[model samples]
Target: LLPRVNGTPPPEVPLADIELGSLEFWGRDDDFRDGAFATLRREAPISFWPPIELAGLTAGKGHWALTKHDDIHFASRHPEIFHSSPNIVIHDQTPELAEYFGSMIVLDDPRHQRLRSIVSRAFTPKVVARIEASVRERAHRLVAAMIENHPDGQADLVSELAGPLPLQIICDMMGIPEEDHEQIFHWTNVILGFGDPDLTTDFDEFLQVSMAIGGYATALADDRRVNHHGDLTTSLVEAEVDGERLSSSEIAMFFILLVVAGNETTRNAISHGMLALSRYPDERAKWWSDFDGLAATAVEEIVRWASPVVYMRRTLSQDVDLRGTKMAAGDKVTLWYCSANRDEEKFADPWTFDVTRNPNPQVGFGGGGAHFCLGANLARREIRVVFDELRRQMPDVVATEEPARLLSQFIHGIKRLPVAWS
Candidate 1:
């Protein structure tokens, strides 16, 4: 049963009493959630959260929330004990839907290893290196367009720059046409912006949007099969491992994953990076002065503070003791990456946006293991290039007001950010 607290935020609610699964719990201001994570880290490092009750579904079994950095890092590395199968989110998903939508990230080893290996073959080091020039070009073009579109020096960074940069590159990677990019962007936004009332008011609409996206990708994969282009889609459709190949449906699903994950996560990182820089002028000044020297560490610090792709779920393979807590087989465990990134033990002055943050073992791209984000290299390149361009072109750009944040727990996103540059 969900707890009914009287006008109190989740962070303010006692750990023993907080219903972390409630949408309202996550819908509150982020500052509250930050405090709540800190409280959980301090009091219930290995806390149990009751099962989530969605509109039409009741998630099976309660989950143990791993709040401390060490606990999340341990669980992420030891996937053998903490499995990722059937479900990666705490909520209940139909087996068929889970298999289709979960893709590589939600599968356990053997199958997960196979799919990842096949996908990796397509996304080779050479292909990644080949894209660096294009990435830089896109960043420069986008910045130029931003200036032209906003000659008055005031604009919404999200609409003009942050959002389009990743969407454009990801579409280019898939060999998708410019005409269809807007449709893909809308669908991707709908899928990830699930809890945002302004974006998706009806849960049923989410299913329709996803199906539309799948159908579109399927059509694209069919075309790529006959006429192979020198692109990721072509590589995915053609590549095989041990004589095993991905079915058209699998390739389509992978495309959806790429669009959603690649587009949404990268955009949010930029949005948050801009906000962080605006908030910390001193750090921003230092970064701009030595942009080349600071790019590597600055990118890491942005991702650490941004903490994109929040908690990922894992199921216990067997009954085990975790920090004196007994968790049974099939029990769900949520590794809160957002909490771990800000962990006091792991990072010094974790809240500060230090550009030259050394030894930053931040897991904004999932903790090290089999499932470390496949697009990490691509994302880093996009971020570094874009920020380099921003510093060069719009050194005086400043966020005008508080951002209109996405109303979701799963993704820390900014829908719109008003900004201006002299």
Candidate 2:
């Protein structure tokens, strides 16, 4: 049983006595580290929920929270019991998308395995390994472009570098044409990051983008099905579940997952990690000196600090007890990734961003069980390639001005990160 850290006595310093600096790092609106996550770590262990009920605008969809380090690991391990299907996101799955976008990675059991297996061929470490040099070259090209465009040293890392690099790499891996990449990029930013005002100005338009993107993906799937190209799309096109072929809708939706999940999360991780480095100058220096070795450490640290996608919800299939908390069948739980990564129980000095920390247990890649990120290798590789080349090319990498952030709780997007060159 976890001991109650806060005793009955209200406080040594009540809210009224708290200083502005003492309020918490998350309170700063501009900074990416929202203290809402830190507050959850202090207040609630099993569940850290938002106090206010939002108008489905800011707070989006509310779900039960899971904050403990162990609990987050628990949910990831028990995909069948906790489940990713029926929902992989907190946002409501529209009835319209029911026909087009829900399949593969999120679906459970037989159907899940079928779609997952086909995609697995491309996602394997061997597949990712073969493409490593090309991915690194892509990262180098992006960094080269960044230096060329921002010779005067003023640019948003998210747009010029972070945004496009991961998407580009993923598109290449999927055998998507260069022409279609930008459309897919814009649509994904709006659809997956709907809550971000900067990313998606109009929720209605975001929905339209989603449907349109689905149709485009369907077209790709149809073409791949007949052509039988040597790409992931064609492989998935021919994949079968129980000897029953996946519908065109299934293909489109699964394509959506590869684009959205692979691209956005990795993109954010790099931006967020750089942000963390900007804050901790010493760590940044260390990372610069040994980009290849330290890049992995930096990525892990960023994931711990960023915890992008905030929380993932899991619906219980059977009655179970979690760390003494009992729940019934069909109860939904949220793995508060943002909170768990900072748990003092598991991570020593969990609050601080120490890039060199070894045996790092950050679950940023969801590396606990069956639900561990299949693309972990790919994600790490993308990050290492970018930062390694970045530090090598621009040893003067630093934030020149305030970093603009995404509005969504999910993606801590560095929307307008101004920087200076030496």
Candidate 3:
């Protein structure tokens, strides 16, 4: 639901409600039913309304909404012109954020390629394969314990499985001390909770939390250098590019990316998929009976279903025509990955939840071009392993209540999922 400036605006919706709805709408709409809300996503297959550019925003200058799959791919691959640095998230950008937290994922080609290659080595398929069983194992142990604890009552999967599973994986990878995991979770919520009216009550407090996290990460990087363990953080610290070393801020930025990247979306995907299963028992049972069917398609489907990180905006370097829309240079082009995932042009019966669905070009984890998510493989492995084990061990799982969503809009995933097991 996009916010409106005036009551005269069609549908007569409040501005705040519209903005938050646009940012946070996912897994809630039954049939893409919210037309005005859907219109907020201009690049979507069934656009509810016109693009934001019509409202007067430009690239480098204002943001253009891109909902098509191919268009997102185009923008992701062409990061040089459509820069990611000026603004990483959708709303707006600040020099303070750019200066303090700069790293591999947020940069364009050349540098991005170099750092991406180094970091990517750690996330290779072979490495991910070694980790797959453990991911499942953790899920099994967690769910198994849950079943024992609440044989009758509903449980919050968001707090129980989704939140901890990915956090545990990330903690292991970065060698994050267990005691510090809560801080990681707390800081992430504040940083990404910028646009949500429900979550962020104080802007200064959020900024302060972000700064504290950065400071702590910087100190941790220093400790890692002195201790010299074989952790991911150490590898990143030791990683060199063009014969130059990464700075403290770079190191903190890496931690920032890891905490934010590896935690929330995967958590939401797992919870959302679980909730989807509870709602669509047929889909859940089909998945349970044929592990291979669901294993192969679940991650893709979950990403599409969750569309965790809703939209990422990029700045246009020059004027370009995208699907009949004239996008001028210096204008901002916001690619709605959530809407793109359900684009009818690319997906057959886009709304249907077919676990066997193939040729699924769901770009929920992103289109995977130049700016493709480095953590996609890790996320996929994490979700598949966790659910496979959960479904096998606890067959009849169901959500008892609506998922509790975060107060923020940029990262629209479940904050809680109350479920019960037989």
Best by TM-score: 1
Q: List the residue pairs that clash in candidate 1.
A: none
Q: State the lDDT of candidate 2 residue by residue for 319-372, as single tens digits.
A: 778766776776667776766776778887665677888778888876376556
- The deviation in Å at residue 161 for candidate 1 is 1.6
Q: Please tell me which predicted candidate would have the highest lDDT against the true structure.
A: 1
Model 3 off-target regions past 4 Å? 1-62, 99-102, 122-134, 148-152, 406-409
Clashes of each: 0, 2, 26
lDDT for every model?
0.81, 0.67, 0.67
lDDT of 3: 0.67
lDDT of 1 at 287: 88
Query: So what's the TM-score on candidate 3?
Result: 0.82
Candidate 2 clash pair list? 26-34, 26-35
Candidate 2 residue-wise lDDT at 97? 61
Estimate TM-scores for all models.
0.91, 0.83, 0.82
After TM-score superposition, the amount by which residue 241's alpha carbon in candidate 1 deviates from its true location, in angstroms, is 1.9
